[PDB]
Amino acid sequence: MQIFVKTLTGKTITLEVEPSDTIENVKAKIQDKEGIPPDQQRLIFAGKQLEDGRTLSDYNIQKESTLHLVLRLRGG
Amino acid sequence: MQIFVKTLTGKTITLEVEPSDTIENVKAKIQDKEGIPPDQQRLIFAGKQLEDGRTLSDYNIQKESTLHLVLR
C-alpha cells in the first residue's frame, strides 16, 4: 500500500509499504530509491518526530499517508 | 571577536567573527580563508552539530570559543 514521504523542498518518495511494515524497514525502502542512510533520515508523522525501530501501526501510518522527511544537518 | 574553528585533523582556523554571524556566513569565511565550500562543512560546538540560519549569538559562541569542523 502506498505512502507519500515528502522530503522538505518537494521530493516526494512514493513507497509501497507492507501490512507488516516497520520504520527502519521503511528507512531501508528510502535507502533504496533516494540513497539516504538511517541517521540522515529523520521522519515526521502525526504529532510525532519518528525514531528507527518501531512499526507503521505504532505511529498510525496507513495507506495513502503523507509522511515528511527531514534530512540530517539541514545546514550548519 | 576571535574564535578558534579547529578541524579534528590538526588545523586551527582562527577567525574574527561577528555576533551577527550565521553558520553558513562562518562557512563562507572558511571558504574564503581555507577554500572549503558550504554544505561540505559541518560545524560542531562541544558535541552538538549546528543548524544553519541560527547565529553565533544564539548558540553563545563568543570569544575564545573552540569549534570543531568536520566534513560530510
Q: Under 8 Å CB-to-CB from A75, ≥6 apart: which residues?
A: B23, B24, B39, B50, B51, B52, B53
Cβ of A73 and B53 within 8 Å? no
Structural biology method used: NMR
Residue with cell 510525532: A48
Cβ-contact B65, B45 below 8 angstroms: yes
| CA B57/CA B59 separation, integer angstroms | 6
| CA A15/CA A22 separation, integer angstroms | 13
In terms of Cβ atoms closer than 10 Å to its own Cβ (0-12, 13-18, 19+), residue A46 is exposed
CB atoms near residue A52 (< 10 Å): 13
- Per DSSP, helices labelled H in chain B are 23-34
Mutate to test the interface with B, among A36, A70, A72, A73 (most CBs of B within 10 A): A73
